Ligand binder design. Structure first.
Ligand SMILES: NCCCCC(=O)O
Ligand SMILES: [Cl-]
Lengths: 529, 107, 118
């Protein structure tokens, strides 16, 4: 039992909880983000996660081959998932690049973000303690913006390529390449430390956050709903898609992981434990993040909703401030960023391993014919590094925000989840799926899972998509920069690169099948033996 | 085939005294995959305990079960006159399904 | 579930054939799996075969893997067991039981019918 929970401990915490959830919650007003979050959690997140693990165990193959055994017509779901993984692996590692840069900057007598007395610093800076005495800027925020990021005025100005961040990305990609090639993973005595360090660090950060003299206001802003005016399609999409992104579902990695699983240790129970604890760690770290934000609000004399960036930089603004107020701040900064690097590196290794496995399973005749697998891994790493170079430039923050919002999140995850649930519930058959689950694990899913797949998840996804289309608002970096029309088109192209996989595969298999149209569709709907 | 063997085939018993009978399995059986059935004389068997700890609807709290891995047993706190019946252990972890030898309580 | 009743038992000869039936009522027959359990005259229980809720997966005991055939009629809510090459050791009482949940076991058992091969 303890060993199983330890093996779980590798995968039920990640950057999606520590970093993504707090900034999405902050961007959507805080408390109002929680209601759709929990609604989607219990409506689809656990049922869809369980459904994908069931698919993976039932087929015992990749996320693309399983649909052949379920529904040949909708085999495009696996392709959409593999492109989602490919797009995610390009922009997810930029977080590790920023963490590596911060870790290298932490090897100093004094943390550079503690005070603003350097060459890269604006003359409008004022210390937070002395701020409550104009358009002043906190040293941490402008450090993040100018030294680590060197933020451009807009996406239309790429600027110069930051050599230091490029070397950080190169280092992280080489680490990933060597780990994948040599099969390096936490399996010996080191798994104890690898699993336990993140939660010890999160506990220390949370304790520091609560004991701040202004944590109460931050907690109140974190938990107080705003149903009067914050009910917008953006909050619904963000909360629903965060559930899918945190669990790594709709990506097809869960299917490949289930393939490895031989049988059921109450797979239902394992999925529920995974989901409950994965959501719990996010909700718990929200307290730490928002307590830090509330203390900064109390110290700087500004509103909680305006203290820090409403974007991916919230984790790189709030946490350094928290570690700045601990005894020997350099020590805790080093430990925090090492923890962040390990948490991101483990999930990066998992994702690149899954992507490589799926891509070689697509073409085993040449890719897997021999030692060319290592060359393929090197090729994938090189192309991903070159693609990530676009987000290293001075205007790379906007590209990163667009990629996060569209490429591996947003409408694409809703599309994939809706098609999976619709296929299994209606085309393949909910009764047949329950029969398969009985044969596998010994008991049927129950009314909750069956009704969720049949109605709740498709209705939620369709309603969110339609609500977004009717009440469409353009994506904005932070809360003041408006993206150009071409940037929005590029983001929608990134989303469509995954969304269009299902219709394209459908028409391709319809054309590549003999017989009349009805015979074609009948042959492609019937599951294979 | 996973053969299940129950040692005390015949047990003379008096009212009030506690009685425990054990089931032995030749292969690893999961805790949730072992169940006991009670069969009265001239009647079809009825479920008594499932998952080695959960009591069926009709069985009173008088009965209880324990065991894990390869040895299982269920005990009676204080046998009554109505407790005289045959009990069979069954494994549900893998096919073919097998039942124990069975102990017929002799009053 | 309330009632499970078997029927069709009788006297046969070695090498003969017989079809057993089990009518079900009080519950949705199509949504629960069914199994046959055999009680020898020596009072020993032996499992015969199991059919899933939809009948897509079918399991047999080693002694009857190539001799007996199990089938169900979801529309009629009735369970059938088919015997082709009944031997001298097949004489016993057959009960049809509900085994939908493998972790819960056979919730209900039928009255049962005796089969003899004298
Ligand atoms: N799309 C999933 C990425 C890693 C999941 C997590 O951060 O928890
Ligand atoms: Cl989350």
């Amino acid at each position: 039992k303890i060993d199983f929970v330890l093996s779980v401990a590798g995968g039920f915490v990640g950057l999606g909880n520590v970093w993504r959830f707090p900034y999405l919650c902050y961007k959507n007003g805080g408390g109002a983000f929680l209601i759709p979050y929990f609604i989607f959690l219990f409506g689809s997140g656990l049922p869809v996660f369980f459904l994908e693990i069931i698919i993976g165990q039932y087929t015992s193959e990749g996320g693309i081959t399983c649909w052949e055994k379920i529904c040949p017509l909708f085999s495009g779901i696996g392709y959409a998932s593999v492109v989602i993984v490919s797009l995610l692996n390009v922009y997810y590692i930029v977080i590790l690049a920023w963490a590596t840069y911060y870790l290298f900057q932490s090897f100093q007598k004094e943390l550079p973000w503690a005070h603003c007395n350097h060459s890269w610093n604006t003359p409008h800076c004022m210390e937070d303690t002395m701020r409550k005495n104009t358009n002043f800027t906190s040293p941490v925020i402008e450090f993040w913006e100018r030294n680590v990021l060197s933020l451009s005025p807009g996406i239309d100005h790429p600027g110069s390529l930051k050599w230091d961040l490029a070397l950080c990305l190169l280092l992280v990609w080489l680490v990933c390449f060597f780990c994948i090639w040599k099969g390096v993973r936490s399996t010996g005595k080191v798994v104890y430390f690898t699993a336990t360090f993140p939660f010890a660090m999160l506990l220390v950060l949370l304790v520091r956050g609560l004991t701040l003299p202004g944590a109460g206001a931050g907690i109140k802003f974190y938990l107080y709903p705003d149903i009067t005016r914050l009910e917008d399609p953006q909050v619904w999409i963000d909360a629903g898609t965060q559930i899918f992104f945190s669990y790594a579902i709709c990506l097809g990695a869960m299917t490949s992981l289930g393939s490895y699983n031989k049988y059921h240790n109450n797979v239902y129970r394992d999925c529920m434990l995974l989901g409950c604890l994965n959501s719990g760690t996010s909700f718990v770290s929200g307290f730490a993040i928002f307590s830090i934000l509330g203390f900064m609000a109390q110290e700087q004399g500004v509103d909680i909703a305006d203290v820090a960036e409403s974007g991916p930089g919230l984790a790189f603004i709030a946490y350094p401030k928290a570690v700045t107020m601990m005894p020997l701040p350099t020590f805790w900064s080093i430990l925090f960023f090492i923890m962040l690097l390990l948490l991101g590196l483990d999930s990066q290794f998992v994702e690149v391993e899954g992507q490589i496995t799926s891509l070689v399973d697509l073409y085993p005749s040449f890719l897997r014919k021999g030692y060319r697998r290592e060359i393929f891994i090197a090729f994938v790493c090189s192309i991903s590094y070159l693609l990530g170079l676009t987000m290293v430039t001075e205007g790379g923050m906007y590209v990163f925000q667009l990629f996060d919002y569209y490429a591996a999140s947003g409408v694409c995850l809703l599309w994939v989840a809706f098609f999976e649930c619709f296929v299994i519930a209606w085309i393949y058959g909910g009764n047949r799926f329950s029969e398969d689950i009985r044969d596998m694990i010994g008991f049927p899913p129950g009314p909750w899972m069956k009704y969720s797949w049949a109605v709740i998840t498709p209705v939620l996804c369709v309603g969110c998509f339609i609500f977004s289309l009717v009440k469409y608002v353009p994506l904005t970096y932070n809360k003041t920069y408006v993206y150009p029309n071409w940037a929005i088109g590029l983001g929608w192209s990134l989303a469509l690169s995954s969304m269009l996989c299902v219709p394209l595969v459908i028409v391709i298999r319809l054309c590549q099948t003999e017989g009349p149209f009805l015979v074609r569709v009948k042959y492609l709907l019937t599951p294979r033996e | 085939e996973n053969v299940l063997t129950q040692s005390p085939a015949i047990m003379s018993t008096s009212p009030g005294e506690k009685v425990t009978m054990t089931c032995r399995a030749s292969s690893s059986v999961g805790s949730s995959y072992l169940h006991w059935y009670q069969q009265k004389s001239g009647a079809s068997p009825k479920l008594w305990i499932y998952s080695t700890s959960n009591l069926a609807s009709g069985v009173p709290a008088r009965f209880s079960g324990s065991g894990s891995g390869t040895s299982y047993s269920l005990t009676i706190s204080s046998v009554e006159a109505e407790d005289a019946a045959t009990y069979y252990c069954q494994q549900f972890s893998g096919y073919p399904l097998t039942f124990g030898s069975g102990t017929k309580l002799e009053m | 579930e309330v009632q499970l009743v078997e029927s069709g038992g009788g006297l046969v000869k070695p090498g003969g054939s017989l079809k057993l039936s089990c009518a079900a009522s009080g519950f949705t027959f199509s949504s629960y799996a069914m199994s046959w359990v055999r009680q020898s005259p020596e009072k020993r229980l032996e499992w015969v075969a199991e059919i899933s809720s939809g009948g897509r997966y079918i399991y047999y005991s080693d002694t009857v893997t190539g001799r007996f055939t199990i089938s169900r009629d979801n529309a009629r809510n009735i369970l059938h067991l088919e015997m082709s090459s009944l031997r001298s050791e097949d004489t016993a009482m057959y009960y049809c039981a509900r085994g939908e949940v493998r972790q819960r076991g056979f919730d209900y058992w039928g009255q049962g019918t005796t089969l003899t091969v004298s």
